Amino acid sequence: EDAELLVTVRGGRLRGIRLKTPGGPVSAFLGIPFAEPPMGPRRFLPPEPKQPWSGVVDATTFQSVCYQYVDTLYPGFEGTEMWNPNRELSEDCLYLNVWTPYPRPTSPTPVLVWIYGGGFYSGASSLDVYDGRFLVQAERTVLVSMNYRVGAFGFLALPGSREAPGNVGLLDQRLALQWVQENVAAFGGDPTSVTLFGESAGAASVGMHLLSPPSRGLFHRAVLQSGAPNGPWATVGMGEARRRATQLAHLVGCPNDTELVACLRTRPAQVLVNHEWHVLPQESVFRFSFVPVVDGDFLSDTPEALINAGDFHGLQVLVGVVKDEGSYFLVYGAPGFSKDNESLISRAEFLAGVRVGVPQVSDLAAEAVVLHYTDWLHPEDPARLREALSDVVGDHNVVCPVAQLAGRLAAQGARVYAYVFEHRASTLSWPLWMGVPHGYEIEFIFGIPLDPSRNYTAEEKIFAQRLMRYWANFARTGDPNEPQWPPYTAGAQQYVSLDLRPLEVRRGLRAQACAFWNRFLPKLLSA
Template sequence: MQPFPFFFFSPFLLFLIPSCSTQSEADFIVQTKSGRVRGFQVTVPDQSRPVVGFLGIPFGEPPVGKRRFRPAEPKRPWQGVYKADSYPNACFQFVDKSYPGFPGIEMWNPNREMSEDCLYLNIWVPSSVKPHNLPVMVWIYGGGFYSGSSSLDVYDGRYLASVENVIVVSMNYRIGAFGFLALDGTSEAPGNVGLLDQRMALQWVQNNIASFGGDPRQVTIFGESAGGASVGYHLLSPGSRPLFTRAILQSGVPNCPWASVTYAEARRRATHLANAVGCNGGNDTELVDCLRGKTPQELIDQEWQVLPWTALFRFSFVPVVDGEVLPDAPEAMVNSGDFKDTQILLGSYGSRKNVNTGAKPLLFKGQEKEPPDLQ
């Protein structure tokens, strides 16, 4: 709409202008269980429905120092109003520098400063006077469990929120050794803490999304590649099942050969990484203490050295069958019917379907339905 051409100016107009606004800054303040957060209005190109964004809301205490490799603790309540108007730090990760400046590579590299203080989530809410009981979609990024960030341009949730009139949530979770280094028998590095980060974010959504106008009974989790495998793990994990309603797995399932390792293999990789960075000898506690004394980049630089030379399409630090988060191997749990019985959408694309979803009949045994021919 073209602005009206005013040909005169009057103090009376100064009085009228503020009253013409339909939403004030106070409308973007939401009370959560942890404290108040302030969002901001986001425009969506080619869409008439604007969106209110809440970027970088903390859901976990920074997993730094002695908390490295351990399950995160929920964010403690804060005073005042938290300004949620910018994307958070990306979790520390491998950065692909093989083709500097090439958009097809750079689009997946972190576009924010990297930090171990990275447990934050983002929310996009369709802008209306009072949204109420809207469906919620929670995105879990992929990246082989070694890379990824909720701040990537391709994960901007404003478009989905505006077009489909749903609340969109995305979260960061620890990846690489920081999220998946595992030594069985020790609470200092039990493994799967990246999955527990995701679960903590899902619990935060259950506790708080109603305050944003969302319906905690209509939460769909969805992810691609390692994110799809993560969605599958939450379908299998007893502690995660109550925290969502439906699931979408895109180009990744938990029984992919690259998506998990045994505790024995996880220990071998952890020990190999320790040796590579100069943490030799001692018991598990001493090994973990030594690894905590290394800079994040020192660990990242050696991550790929832990893979067996025969490994093909494998990633260094991934989820482990720990008997708790993942009680048994995915195949065994599916065969015994031990998973969340709910509506599931599964998809793959092009050349990835054989590598990533070849185990589809196993994951959904008895539930398979061929998709319609859309050609």
């Protein structure tokens, strides 16, 4: 046997697998159980630690994906299938994965922990684009990723109730981080150098562990890619969370919270998924049914309030966005949009799209959005309207929440590094009009262009190696440098552009637009 693939953790023994990369072998331990399967009576309940096992757990292949909706907008299209589950769906899905150099490190190695995105309703650590083999070989870190419950199974909340308290998907992540603290040294990892990174809802999850004290002691640095806990989509209030959970029960034939949750636990998992989207209050894009709830427990206040009231001295954070955060979501409900044509919409379609992209706001608020995003010298140009409503969705949901997080963190003691990812992949399968869409920096952070079986250019392989160096440098030292990448400050607002060209320093993360979302709109909605 290969002694390098045998590991004993607190719960028992594991057998791993040796993987190949163009730069040499790596050790992988896939499908390690870290929680008891949240089946039957454990549905909706907080996770509990996996009990010890005898024998050797086979950790050579990925485990099941947590039960989730499957996208059917473009069947067979790679641009959407790459995010769909690539393993069997199951509620028995609380497993994590460890990648480590081969042979395993003998001295403590910095740890990167990946939290996937997918709007709190989808995602899996087994997706090809999250393959940790290249980061580990190239930068000699330990990479851990976990699966956490999504959809109703992870975030259905009847606030106050104990049968369905909410946020258990976040607790799945916290349990995995506790598992890392207790077991990563057995793989060569340093439990005192843990860097969280995630994208979208994963980035939102990273930020929520930053604002929940029981999680704060489980890591030391944070990376937030195209997401933040303080957006309009990553949290929901107790009242609306209760309305959605109650509505879901009605749609599946269920009836007192105890009796309500009791009935929901009798339904097949696929039945809950089939009605998940129908509990949203209106037509929308960039909105998801079951998300973290602000109930005073995991989050003792709104993330915005927790960000403004925090002392963040001693914290290093890496945040950033892609060039066109909004484009991807427009084909999921904005009238006039799809991947198949130029999406050259009209004024009427733009105005209708604003109510879809900014749902659940007063008409006056919507008019304010139209004022700020209309070019009143070209109020009806279709190309400008397409770009503008992409800006509306992208700034409202990603860029401006990320800009607000960065500004307040920097102004309250944290050292912040900000980027804008501006390279359109040569292999990109979405249309040109989408630009650099949400989620298409990940494959470069994970070094997927180094895979010889794929068709990335030579330049793109070099660019991926740069990005892996920045990310790993930040994990080791809190700084990606060593042309310089300067810290982001609330005044200078400096960031860098990441593309095939060398680093270029710029000012302002859509500062004009984000003054509207972050400073003026909250005042308007309050009056």
